[PDB]
């Protein structure tokens, strides 16, 4: 797994070179965003259960076929697995947000997920819909101006949306 | 047992080995043999650097402060095991590996994935590891004092699908779980989900077609639905798996791996054509009745 | 590899948990440290040539037989002198990686793991590298947190060698 | 695994339906055949050793290449493995008979058996010939009119024949 | 899917054994029970709409805040009332499966496994379902073995929820 | 207990390593936080009775049937009201422990592990305690890092209950 | 294969639903970006030969084992195949950019490519490095502000970057 | 295991009380010592190899009977084990220093160590002497006034001395 810093170090070592001034400046710029990053992780985490449950409620309302008898999310066992998957994805999205690198999301969560859903008949498109609902909910939470030092989080918000979009694409 | 095909399947060295048991009042050489066996088994024959050794756990094993099983447990829960097998893997991959390392067999069913995925998700990696080691299956095969080993041979409680799947996880003696063609990808996600099996392709060196691996999509099904009708007059059909196709070159050649269903009466032509493609036969399996 | 951000996620991942205040504190600890590390990495990088050559000469001075004795493992010819300067350069460069990453990860993965077998196989004395590492410690001219973090990695390598 | 009752249940839950009156009536007809099913299992089991050994002898007589030096059933290790497999296949056929559903036979025994034998060089066609011999002996044992309450076991005998046929078709 | 027949084979298989008199007796036990179970399933199925409706009303009377309180988890509006009657219908239907199967298998697989996650996640009180199950026990009109087997499954669900 | 310091040491011990810069940075993170955590703990402790009584009343308001319905699990008598106030006090006191320890360790060890079994066994609604925890979040009057850390622990419990 | 429009249509037919108002407006927003999308496809296409050759030159400079005798890219036929492959991958990335959907890339290019390379002994990690270098060059060309109407192409760039990321991940 | 903070928490929990203002202030004072504690751990760790080797050298010089043939530290394996133990004990002492509580040292290292040594024939008094030698070297390294911000470290140095003494007594 890589974080924002080790990603650059790994590339540099493969070329046998010191980090250039620009690279050290880019990382310094990343450090200057650290507090916003931490706040975004904290805010998403603090609302984890609501994000997952609301997204799931909305998905089933839009897509009633998922919960009709015989639907993919029917029976407590499958419904539980469905809720579990949404939480797993949200969890690794926060890891990636926290580390500043998507590798943890790709390696632990997304590499092999499409193959799993295809093999089991899980409607990946519907998972992507659910992920998008968690995305919209999460970004609203991260952007709430109230109760926090005011500042510009647009850059961090874009990075997080990238992770959600990456998750959604991987299963669709 | 496995006799005629043992060498080509990479099983012969395990046929030639006995379980590594730590007897009461063991000698230091006994302890060293256990430690070596546990590192080879539980870490999937990766090279282990001196800086990566679990010196404290080794001391406790040598002292009899922990039994073999507790030493296995410690290795399985170590940052070394997790770095090798957890942090970079899809959890289904992790479960495959745990089964191979700690039980010496491949998962039988999707139920095992459900159980261990939920256990990990609800209680964490350590809890999941304990479930393998404290399992009835672990107790019956290895008990407190025997290092886990590959269970190639048929035992009570087995299922046939286990035998074929071991050769999806075990790729030969001079090989490690982290140095296999499929790299980090789950080997069994699709097999488990569909409850299907794949033709066995033995290790490199002793099998020319060792590299055959199917693609994500556009594969040939195992059985010849429709029988010989599409082929005209044909007595019986076979599914041939072919790898290393290169000779015509792109775009005439797209995928170097291909499985074809061909009639008995064209096998001579098929082998001739395969050779001229440069390809290597990975497996041949009857496809009709 | 061992860095604060990777350890935090690795802990939470092993437990199957969302990140919590413990991990957030780990991140703040990184943030408090990062600029000093980046500053130290820049200073070492800009000074790398002097450091590597100075360290190489310090070793030759402390172990004069290394430039007087014939042998593939010694620096009595230009071939060996280039190997030795190359080697010291690896230590210095990989130490700057630790300062960037905020942990020993780079040293652990790229240099330490297996170094004992190499030094044994090619008959290289760990003491030679300790002297070079001591020279870098004495001459990098760093201060404050830059110095402390940098010296922790240099000593980390020294301890691994001894 | 499924049994005859849980096979119908699983299909009903997949459609969200209560079992129909005819479905329930069919299961009652199954219950009414229960004693004959139990007798058939008991008779095969009580003769298991004879069924296996007689079939192995006949097979090796008809296909002597199997036991000549170099043959796949030659040497004690391989002959023991061959006899074991015949017993295993018989055992699972009885399990399927007992439960009234082929799933235990298919899931635990037959799935992957073709690939296994191909990998090992076991001659699958010969295994099938052995299974057929066990089939004939077993059905004759099941149909023996002596020492039992007389009645029509043709339906049970046909079901058991079907299970032996699945086994024969899978190995080859 | 726990039933007598599949449990019999599971145990024999795990021991590598042919079926013996022990498993045959298990089969005779199932046969003794089966017709009463099928009758019970029929009776419940035929009376399902009355049972499901009555049970839902039983819940509403016991927990009147469910039909008066706004929220996605309550039955104040027709939406929530439909969910609730649906859920009660699931319990009853799957119970009929248990009587057909002759074991908790169907409840274990289709309803009980995961129910605590669902109830927690969607803020549903398991007490609501206990009361629904108690109503069904009090009103299905079964007697004898039909009653006992059915009540065992209703009780099994009740115990899982408590 | 999941605290930054013990986790750092446990991970180091797993690898048989001395502590390094990574773990020192974990310690600085803890130090940056600790004064704020302690200030939060004092503020919650000084206002504990107000917060606990207010939280209990908030639950009674949102869920009036709890003070009106007879039953061991409800607060219609003084017995039940006392249990309820005691329970909320437990949540608050342990949250103050999390602030002192700098992690969810105390909540995990003392309250969260096994709360599901308790709430199920004694038919307590997790929504009751969610409501109390929301009251406490909205009335502790903390600001800055103390607010951030206090709310993370309050949200950790809420998330666990849902 | 899907394009951005038919991807959405597919998910709607699966549920038997007319596209929602928000879905139609999302596709309008996609249309509004159409010119930027065409420009990006055109710039990558216009610079294809240089993108490939510069990337290849950088790859073999950083990984000289490839082109030493015995290296996988040694001999004219292997070097030619290697240069061809990089062009193929770039071509399908432009296809995916043009359609606004990864299906063409995933189906026609990346399917079985990892498996092809291992079977032939082609080092996939080195293929992935080549894709990375092409990605870096391609995005700079697409982001070039000279000679074009000024605007924000950040979203198209992110999408293109994503397609390169898929390619790099797939080859190994 | 406890750290300085959770030690107090656990005592308060067993009494069912909030921490007193006096206890909180005591922890605040501990926080004010944090930098000195971190430096002390860093300084011991930085010098660990030297502390162990010099102490071991001094130990054998004073106790040659350990390293004569038949002595407990004679032969490479036993000498190696002895050196390993010295480092383990030092490592755990630094753990205790880092956490501010002896529980890690007591619970993981010392508990049962005396019994191990008595059973092996390892001379506990000689281990204790070795630990004492390591202690003296460690305290001098910690107290070294050069290259560090000047201040009073007598409190932290006293705590470290206590941890070393615990280890010495636990085996002595
Ligand atoms: C976008 C995410 C929103 C946003 C973020 C934002 N945060 C800060 C500054 C700080 N945030 C913290 C966070 C914490 N302190 C703690 O103790 C904990 C609990 C463990 C957390 C999560 C801290 C320490 C700071 C620095 C001090 C401060 O409180 O200001 C900023 C300011 C920029 C900066 O950090 O330099 C911003 C912008 N602000 C918004 O308006 C977005 C909605
Ligand atoms: C085809 C299978 C043959 C056949 C079977 C058959 N059996 C019965 C009846 C019974 N068989 C049993 C069996 C057992 N009782 C025991 O205690 C044990 C040991 C555990 C066994 C195996 C029983 C209990 C009955 C019922 C009582 C009775 O003895 O009759 C029938 C009669 C019809 C029925 O279904 O009950 C039949 C037809 N009969 C044949 O002629 C076939 C060769
Ligand atoms: C990011 C990609 C860069 C960028 C692009 C950009 N392009 C336009 C507008 C137009 N581009 C074209 C393209 C063509 N016209 C042709 O005839 C052909 C040859 C077949 C091509 C490729 C057209 C037709 C337009 C519209 C008219 C115009 O010239 O403006 C825009 C403006 C926004 C828009 O069109 O909606 C932008 C932003 N701009 C940058 O700064 C990036 C480097
Ligand atoms: C919920 C929004 C949708 C849904 C989900 C669903 N998933 C499964 C089953 C599985 N999900 C996974 C997922 C993972 N395994 C991992 O290792 C990781 C990363 C750490 C993830 C995310 C797996 C492996 C399975 C199989 C095992 C299991 O069943 O739990 C199911 C059950 C499918 C079945 O047939 O049993 C479901 C229902 N289903 C929907 O309809 C929603 C759109
Ligand atoms: C040295 C001349 C070349 C070289 C070698 C190299 N090999 C590996 C990794 C492994 N080598 C083996 C081989 C064996 N393991 C066995 O047990 C046996 C005997 C039965 C053999 C022959 C294995 C299995 C591995 C993988 C396990 C592991 O821990 O690595 C590497 C490491 C690669 C990497 O770390 O990524 C290397 C470097 N490399 C060269 O460049 C030389 C040409
Ligand atoms: C270049 C960066 C690397 C490299 C390449 C390389 N590839 C081959 C051979 C083949 N490549 C393909 C590729 C494809 N087939 C498809 O259908 C598509 C998608 C549409 C692709 C990308 C195929 C089929 C072959 C085999 C047929 C052919 O050779 O044309 C080789 C030659 C292999 C050989 O053994 O001769 C090489 C060298 N090699 C490197 O080292 C680079 C990292
Ligand atoms: C005690 C035995 C000796 C001593 C210690 C001492 N240290 C400080 C202050 C600081 N020490 C540090 C340490 C580090 N900074 C880093 O970046 C790292 C590497 C990861 C370390 C180990 C820091 C951050 C400080 C505070 C800032 C500063 O510039 O000083 C003091 C001063 C009081 C205080 O606690 O802040 C003291 C006393 N001093 C002695 O004289 C003893 C020999
Ligand atoms: C001779 C001392 C007595 C005797 C022999 C006899 N043997 C069989 C049948 C078999 N003998 C074997 C033995 C082996 N098969 C091997 O592969 C090897 C290892 C290399 C050995 C030792 C086997 C397996 C059989 C059964 C299968 C077969 O027929 O080959 C028979 C016939 C038994 C039957 O029922 O057909 C006989 C007669 N019998 C005597 O009375 C002699 C005193
Ligand atoms: C006998 C009629 C024929 C025959 C059989 C034969 N089989 C093997 C080896 C194996 N048979 C199996 C089969 C199973 N394993 C299972 O788990 C199941 C269901 C539970 C079945 C049916 C397996 C896996 C093996 C290999 C592993 C092992 O034997 O322990 C052999 C020996 C192969 C060898 O020695 O290499 C033989 C001889 N052979 C014939 O020629 C007969 C036609
Ligand atoms: C009725 C006693 C009370 C009630 C019910 C109610 N339930 C839901 C939502 C769900 N109910 C279930 C239950 C099941 N799904 C299954 O597959 C099975 C097993 C076969 C069961 C038992 C589930 C999973 C949900 C959530 C998903 C879905 O919508 O289907 C609601 C709505 C909750 C929400 O947030 O939308 C309600 C209202 N509510 C009362 O007040 C009654 C007393
Ligand atoms: C010398 C007559 C003139 C010259 C040469 C020159 N060549 C290259 C680059 C390459 N040369 C080759 C040739 C081969 N590679 C093979 O594998 C074989 C067959 C065995 C041959 C003949 C190749 C493939 C390259 C490109 C890849 C590589 O770098 O190896 C260059 C550099 C080109 C560049 O852009 O890097 C040069 C300079 N140049 C002159 O001016 C001479 C008159
Ligand atoms: C001689 C070639 C060179 C040399 C020797 C030297 N050795 C030591 C110290 C030790 N030597 C050993 C070796 C062993 N101890 C054993 O039990 C066995 C196995 C039976 C062996 C081989 C050990 C363990 C030590 C350290 C402990 C001890 O003092 O006994 C020294 C002193 C090192 C020190 O720091 O005190 C020396 C000088 N030195 C040379 O320069 C010679 C060329
Ligand atoms: C050195 C100063 C003295 C000395 C030491 C010595 N110790 C042993 C053996 C063991 N030491 C330990 C201790 C630990 N193992 C751990 O994992 C931990 C952390 C929890 C500790 C504290 C153990 C367990 C052993 C026994 C197993 C092993 O060999 O590692 C020996 C070897 C004894 C023998 O006969 O094998 C020695 C020599 N001996 C001296 O004379 C010095 C005073």
Q: What is the DSSP letter of B64?
A: T
Burial of B40 (0-12, 13-18, 19+ CB in 10 A): middle
* Pairwise CA distance, residues G133 & D109, whole Å: 51
B239 in helix, strand or coil?
A: strand
C84 is in an annotated binding site: yes
Angle at H170 between CA H166 and CA H172, to 5 degrees: 110
User: Is residue B51 less than 8 Å (CB to CB) from chain H?
Assistant: no
* Pairwise CA distance, residues B196 & D111, whole Å: 8
User: Is B246 in Cβ contact with G115 (below 8 Å)?
Assistant: no
Q: Helix E21-46 and helix E78-101: axis angle, to 10°?
A: 150
E41-80 in b/e burial notation, b at 16+ Cβ within 10 A? bbbbbebbeebbebbbebbbebbebbbebeeebbbeeeeb
Q: Under 8 Å CB-to-CB from A144, ≥6 apart: which residues?
A: A43
* Pairwise CA distance, residues A125 & A59, whole Å: 11
Distance E10 CA to ligand 9 centre (A): 22
Look at strands B237-243 and B258-263 and give their pairing. Answer: antiparallel
- Short-list H112, H108, H90, H161, CA closest to H1: H108
The helix or strand, by DSSP H or E, that contains position E149, with its residue range, turns out to be helix E144-161
- Short-list F4, F25, F23, CA closest to F15: F23
For ligand 10, say whether the CB of E74 is within 6 Å of any of its atoms: yes
DSSP E42-83: HHHHHTHHHHHHHHHHHHHHH-GGGGTS-STTS-SSHHHHHH
The preferred substitution site among G61, G78, G109 for testing ligand 6, maximizing ligand atoms within 8 Å of CB, is: G78
Tokens matching residue B3? 């006799």
Residue pair H73/H60 in contact by the 8 Å Cβ criterion: yes
For atom 24 of ligand 10, which residue has the closest CA?
E118
Only one residue has tokens 């004495």, namely C138
* Pairwise CA distance, residues E44 & D18, whole Å: 10
* Pairwise CA distance, residues H129 & H141, whole Å: 19
* Pairwise CA distance, residues G170 & G165, whole Å: 8
Only one residue has tokens 């929504």, namely F127
* Pairwise CA distance, residues C39 & C37, whole Å: 5
Tokens matching residue E115? 């129910």
The preferred substitution site among H52, H56, H76, H85 for testing ligand 13, maximizing ligand atoms within 8 Å of CB, is: H85
* Pairwise CA distance, residues A147 & A84, whole Å: 30
Helix, strand, coil shares of chain B as percentages rounded to 5? 40, 10, 50
Contacts of D9 in chain A (CB under 8 A): none
User: Is residue H77 less than 8 Å (CB to CB) from chain B?
Assistant: yes
- Short-list B213, B211, B195, B214, CA closest to B203: B211
Measured CA distances, H110 to B62, C20, C139 (Å): 18, 32, 41
DSSP chain H: ---HHHHHHHHHHHHT-PPPHHHHHHHHHHHHTHHHHHHHHHHHHHTHHHHHHHHHHHHHHH-GGGTSTTSTT-SHHHHHHHHHHHHHHHHHHHHHHHHTSTHHIIIIIITTHHHHHHHHT--HHHHHHHHHHHHHHHHHHHH--TTS-----HHHHHHHHHHHHHHHHHH-
Q: What is the DSSP letter of G102?
A: S
* N residues, chain B: 289
- Short-list D49, D130, D59, D127, CA closest to D91: D49
Q: What is the DSSP letter of B21?
A: B
Provide the CA B42 distance to its chain's centre, in angstroms.
14
E1 in helix, strand or coil?
A: coil
H helices within C16-143, ranges in order? 21-46, 48-62, 78-101, 105-106, 115-121, 126-139
Order of strands across the sheet with B237-243? Answer: B258-263, B237-243, B280-286
Strands (E), B167-272: 237-243, 258-263
* Pairwise CA distance, residues D111 & D91, whole Å: 15
B240 in helix, strand or coil?
A: strand
* Pairwise CA distance, residues E33 & E25, whole Å: 12
* Pairwise CA distance, residues H27 & F97, whole Å: 12
Only one residue has tokens 């090796």, namely D60
* Pairwise CA distance, residues A74 & E113, whole Å: 12
- Short-list C105, C120, C82, CA closest to C153: C105
* Pairwise CA distance, residues H3 & F7, whole Å: 10
Q: Helix A34-46 and helix C21-46: axis angle, to 10°?
A: 160
Helix count and strand count (H, E) for chain A: 9, 0
Residue of F15, F20, F116 to mutate when probing chain B, most B C-beta within 10 A? F15
User: SS3 letters for B134-186?
Assistant: CCHHHHHHCCCCECCCCCCCCCCCCCHHHHHHHHHHCCCCCCCCCCCCCCCCC
CATH number of the F1-162 domain: 1.10.490.20
* Pairwise CA distance, residues D68 & E137, whole Å: 69
Burial of A44 (0-12, 13-18, 19+ CB in 10 A): buried
Tokens matching residue E142? 């079964």
* Pairwise CA distance, residues D172 & D161, whole Å: 17
The number of distinct structural domains making up chain H is 1
* Pairwise CA distance, residues E121 & F162, whole Å: 5
* Pairwise CA distance, residues D131 & D169, whole Å: 10
Only one residue has tokens 């060996």, namely C80
Dihedral of CA atoms F91, F93, F97, F98 in degrees, nearest 10, equals 30
Measured CA distances, C71 to C68, C118, C124 (Å): 10, 16, 11
Residue pair B99/B76 in contact by the 8 Å Cβ criterion: no
- Short-list C71, C93, C67, C91, CA closest to C81: C67
- Short-list D117, D44, D133, D118, CA closest to D82: D117
Q: Under 8 Å CB-to-CB from E67, ≥6 apart: which residues?
A: E60, E74, E75, E76, E81
| Structural domain boundaries enclosing G118 | 1-172
Residue pair B107/B165 in contact by the 8 Å Cβ criterion: yes
Tokens matching residue A28? 């310094």
Q: Which experimental method was this entry solved with?
A: cryo-EM
* Resolution (Å) of this entry: 1.9
* Pairwise CA distance, residues G84 & A168, whole Å: 32
A141-167 in b/e burial notation, b at 16+ Cβ within 10 A? ebeeeeeeeeeebeebbebbbbbbbbb
**How many beta carbons lie within 10 A of that of residue B169, not counting itself?**
21
Residue of H116, H118, H120, H121 to mutate when probing chain B, most B C-beta within 10 A? H116
- Short-list C132, C157, C142, C162, CA closest to C38: C142
> Which neighbouring-strand residues pair with B21?
B146
Look at strands B280-286 and B237-243 and give their pairing. Answer: antiparallel
Instruction: Supply the CATH number for residue A7's domain.
Output: 1.10.490.20
Burial of D136 (0-12, 13-18, 19+ CB in 10 A): middle
Pocket of ligand 6 from Cβ distances under 6 Å: B 246, 249-250, 253-254, 256; G 66, 72-73, 78, 81-82, 85-86, 88, 108-109, 113, 116, 120, 122-123, 126-127, 130
User: Is F7 in Cβ contact with C25 (below 8 Å)?
Assistant: no
Pocket of ligand 4 from Cβ distances under 6 Å: A 66, 72-73, 78, 81-82, 85-86, 88, 108-109, 113, 116, 120, 122-123, 126-127, 130; B 90-92, 113-114, 117
The shortest CB-CB distance from C9 to any of A1, A12, A34 is to A1
* N residues, chain D: 172
* Pairwise CA distance, residues G89 & G111, whole Å: 12
């Amino acid at each position: 797994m890589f974080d924002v810093f080790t990603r650059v170090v790994s590339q540099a070592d493969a070329r046998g070179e010191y980090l250039s001034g620009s690279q050290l400046d880019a990382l310094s710029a990343t450090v200057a965003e650290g507090n916003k990053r931490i706040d975004s992780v904290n805010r998403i985490t603090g609302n984890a259960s609501a994000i997952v449950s609301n997204a799931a409620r909305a998905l089933f309302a839009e897509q009633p076929q998922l919960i009709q008898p015989g639907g993919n999310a029917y029976t407590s066992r499958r419904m539980a697995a469905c809720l579990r998957d949404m939480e797993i994805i949200l969890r690794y999205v926060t890891y990636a947000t926290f580390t500043g690198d998507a590798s943890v999301l790709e390696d632990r969560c997304l590499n092999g997920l499409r193959e799993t859903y295809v093999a089991l008949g899980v409607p990946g498109a519907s998972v992507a819909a659910g992920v998008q609902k968690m995305k919209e909910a999460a970004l609203d939470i991260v952007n709430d101006p109230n109760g926090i030092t005011r500042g510009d989080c647009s850059a961090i918000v874009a990075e997080i949306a990238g992770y959600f979009d990456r998750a959604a694409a991987a299963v669709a | 047992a496995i006799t005629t095909a043992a060498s080509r399947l990479g099983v012969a060295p395990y046929n030639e080995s006995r379980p590594v048991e730590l007897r009461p009042d063991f000698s230091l050489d006994d302890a060293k043999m256990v430690i070596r066996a546990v590192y080879r088994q539980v870490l999937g024959n990766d090279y282990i650097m001196d800086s990566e050794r679990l010196k404290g756990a080794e001391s406790l094993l040598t002292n009899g402060s922990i039994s073999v099983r507790e030493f296995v447990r410690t290795v399985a829960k170590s940052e070394l095991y997790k770095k090798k097998f957890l942090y970079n893997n899809f959890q289904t991959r992790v479960i495959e590996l745990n089964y191979k390392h700690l039980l010496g067999r491949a998962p039988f069913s999707e139920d095992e994935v459900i159980f261990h995925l939920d256990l990990y998700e609800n209680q964490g990696f350590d809890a999941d590891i304990d479930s393998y080691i404290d399992s009835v299956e672990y107790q019956e095969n290895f008990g407190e004092n025997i290092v886990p080993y590959y269970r190639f041979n048929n035992q009570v409680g087995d299922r046939t699908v286990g035998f074929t799947r071991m050769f999806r996880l075990y790729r030969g003696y001079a090989n490690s779980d982290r140095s296999q063609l499929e790299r980090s990808s789950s080997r069994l996600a699709t097999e488990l989900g569909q409850n299907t099996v794949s033709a066995i392709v033995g290790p490199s060196g002793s099998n020319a077609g060792w590299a055959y691996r199917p693609s994500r999509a556009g594969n040939t099904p195992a059985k010849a639905l429709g029988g010989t009708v599409p082929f005209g007059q044909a007595s019986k059909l076979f599914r041939v798996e072919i790898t290393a196709i290169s000779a015509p070159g792109y775009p005439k050649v797209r995928r170097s791996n291909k499985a074809v269903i061909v009639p008995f009466e064209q096998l001579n032509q098929t082998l001739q054509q395969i050779n001229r493609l440069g390809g290597k036969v990975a497996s041949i399996t009857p496809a009709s009745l | 590899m061992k860095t604060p951000l990777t350890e935090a996620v690795s802990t939470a991942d092993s437990q199957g948990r969302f990140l919590s205040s413990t991990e957030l504190q780990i991140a703040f600890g990184r943030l408090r440290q990062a600029n000093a590390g980046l500053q130290a990495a820049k200073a070492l990088t800009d000074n790398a040539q002097s450091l590597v050559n100075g360290a190489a000469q310090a070793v030759y001075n402390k172990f004069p037989y290394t430039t007087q004795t014939q042998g593939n493992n010694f620096a009595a010819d230009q071939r060996g002198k280039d190997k030795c300067a190359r080697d010291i350069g690896y230590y210095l460069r990989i130490v700057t990686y630790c300062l960037v990453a905020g942990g020993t990860g780079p040293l652990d993965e790229y240099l330490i793991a297996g170094i004992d077998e190499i030094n044994r196989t090619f008959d290289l004395s760990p003491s030679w590298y300790v002297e070079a590492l001591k020279y870098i410690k004495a001459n990098h001219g760093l201060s404050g947190d830059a110095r402390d973090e940098a010296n922790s990695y240099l000593d980390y390598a020294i301890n691994a060698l001894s």
